[PDB]
């Protein structure tokens, strides 16, 4: 996640 230290899932 640009600018963040957090994670997120990708989107097919």
């Amino acid at each position, epitope marked *: *996640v*640009p600018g963040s230290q957090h994670i997120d899932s990708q989107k097919k």
Partner: antibody
Amino acid sequence: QIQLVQSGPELKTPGETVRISCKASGYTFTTYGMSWVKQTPGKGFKWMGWINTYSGVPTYADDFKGRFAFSLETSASTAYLQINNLKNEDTATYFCARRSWYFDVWGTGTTVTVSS
Amino acid sequence: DVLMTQTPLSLPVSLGDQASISCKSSQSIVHSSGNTYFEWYLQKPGQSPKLLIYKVSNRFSGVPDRFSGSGSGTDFTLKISRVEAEDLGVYYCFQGSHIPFTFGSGTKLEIKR
């Protein structure tokens, strides 16, 4: 609760150096990345870059590489912005912002007025 | 950079009425992951920015359901259905998908009374 308190208004002469503190309370400082954003009176907001509070590694945006330093004191839960050889054009309110998928908490704001 | 152009610049609206504010990006703000880190902030006079919506349409915590967001790729809109006096402030969109992160010039909500 969660607070990001910033230092107060500084009046500086051109060529001077300012340091702006961002003290975070109410959450573990090393788990959210910190941004710094400039709000020029009238002209709107520019994002300045961010610093990963875990690795200590800073990212500056192209128009702020050079005279701008983000640094950290993690035992004090404080982020710092240093601006050297202060130009007139740096008169703005500066904000630290915590970001996860968004900026949910924004600092109080510090105005700097550079002026001879 | 991704230019973010926002319309209107001023939006007088009656209490009770609906209001939309749109923002157009100059290139797509879909992150390479497929997600769109797109957000709406409100700033009141003498106050720090308030998070309204993230990821195009998700209301943040404790935000009133009257606020809702929409749009795809380059065109987005925030709608306030039923404007209350308290929604006074300036609304700004932000994209956080492509570095550098950019904001819209803002839209000033004025209440017709």
